Every structure is written in C-alpha cells, then in structure tokens.
Amino acid sequence: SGNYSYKRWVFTINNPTFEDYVHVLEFCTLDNCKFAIVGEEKGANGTPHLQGFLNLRSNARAAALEESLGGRAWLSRARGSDEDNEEFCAKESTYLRVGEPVS
DNA sequence: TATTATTACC
Ligand SMILES: [Ca+2]
Ligand SMILES: [Ca+2]
Ligand SMILES: [Mn+2]
C-alpha cells in the first residue's frame, strides 16, 4: 500500500453482498472507530450501495482496510470533516452510526 | 491506495 495510510477514510461498496454487510457490521465498532457512519443508499442508477466514513483509532493501510470491509470497497482518504461525512452518509435515512464526529 | 462502480466526503 506504499505510504497510503490514514485514520480517516471514505468508502463505497456497490451491490453489497451479505458478507459485505457482515464485515462492515463487525468492523464498525468502538473497538476500531472513534466515529463511523454507513448509509444504505441508491443513486440515480438505482444501484444499491453502502456509503461510509471511518475515523479509525489507528492508521490503516488500504489493503488492511480493504480486508476488514470485505474486499469489495472503493476506498480513499477523507478530505472533508467528520461532520461533513456524518451529514453526507445519513442523507438517505437508513444508516448505522458509531461514536461521535471528532473535530 | 483497493476496488466496484457513477457511487465516492472537501
Ligand atoms: Ca488521517
Ligand atoms: Ca454473501
Ligand atoms: Mn451514495
């Protein structure tokens, strides 16, 4: 993963499988996260997807985070604030939330 | 980065 290692990440999982949901539920806990929010969403195409943000307690490299989330996620370092992500990932009103946004 | 996709924060 080179030096691409962060605590704060965005992720998307398109067409989540049952196993994707299990990995996300098992990982998005206070053990691992200061704050996490994951919304179940559909865009204009109607493709169901998980829309997620993680503020992790420890740095993760992409390969490790990929494994933790089930292996099918698009990942990138977060550029907005925790609150920006809390609003964005809650916008379709079917979501899981762990912890509180960190300023 | 790793990865499935038009979804992806600022
Ligand atoms: Ca970080
Ligand atoms: Ca499955
Ligand atoms: Mn979305």
Author numbering: 4 to 106
Quote what the paper states about this structure.
To better understand the roles that coordinated divalent ions play in Rep function, we resolved two cocrystal structures of the endonuclease domain of DCV Rep in complex with a cognate ssDNA 10-mer (5′-TATTATTACC-3′) derived from the DCV Ori, with and without manganese coordinated in the active site. Precleavage complexes were obtained using the dDCV mutant. The substrate in both structures conforms to the characteristic “U”-shaped architecture, indicating that the ssDNA conformation is largely facilitated by the DNA binding interface and intramolecular base pairing and base stacking, with little support from the coordinated cation. In the DCV plus Mn2+ structure, the Mn2+ is coordinated by His52 and Gln54 within the HUQ motif along with the third residue of the coordinating triad Glu44, and a water, which, in turn, is positioned by Glu95. Two hydrogen bonds from the scissile phosphate complete the octahedral coordination of Mn2+. A conserved Lys94 is oriented toward the catalytic residue and facilities a hydrogen bond with the scissile phosphate, adding evidence that this lysine may not only be a general base but that it might also play a cooperative structural role with the ion in stabilizing the ssDNA backbone in the active site. In further comparisons of these two structures, we noticed the ssDNA substrate seemed to be positioned much farther into the active site in the presence of Mn2+. In the absence of Mn2+, the measured distance is 3.0 Å, whereas when Mn2+ is coordinated in the active site, and the scissile phosphate is pulled 0.7 Å closer to the oxygen, with a measured distance of 2.3 Å. Considering that Mn2+ coordination includes two ion-dipole bonds with the scissile phosphate, it is likely this is the driving force behind bringing the tyrosine in close proximity to the phosphate.
HUH endonucleases are diverse enzymes that contain an eponymous motif consisting of a pair of conserved metal-coordinating histidine (H) separated by a bulky hydrophobic residue (U). Replication-initiating HUH endonucleases (Reps) are sequence-specific nucleases that cleave and rejoin single-stranded DNA (ssDNA) during rolling-circle replication. Replication initiator proteins (Reps) from this HUH endonuclease superfamily are found in a variety of bacterial plasmids and viral genomes, including circular Rep-encoding single-stranded DNA (CRESS-DNA) viruses that are known to infect organisms across all three domains of life (1–5). These enzymes initiate rolling-circle replication through sequence-specific processing of the viral single-stranded DNA (ssDNA) genome via cleavage and subsequent phosphotyrosine covalent linkage to the ssDNA’s newly exposed 5′ end. Following linkage, the genome’s freed 3′-OH can be used as a primer for DNA replication before its ultimate return to the active site, where it attacks the phosphotyrosine intermediate to rejoin and release the circular ssDNA genome.
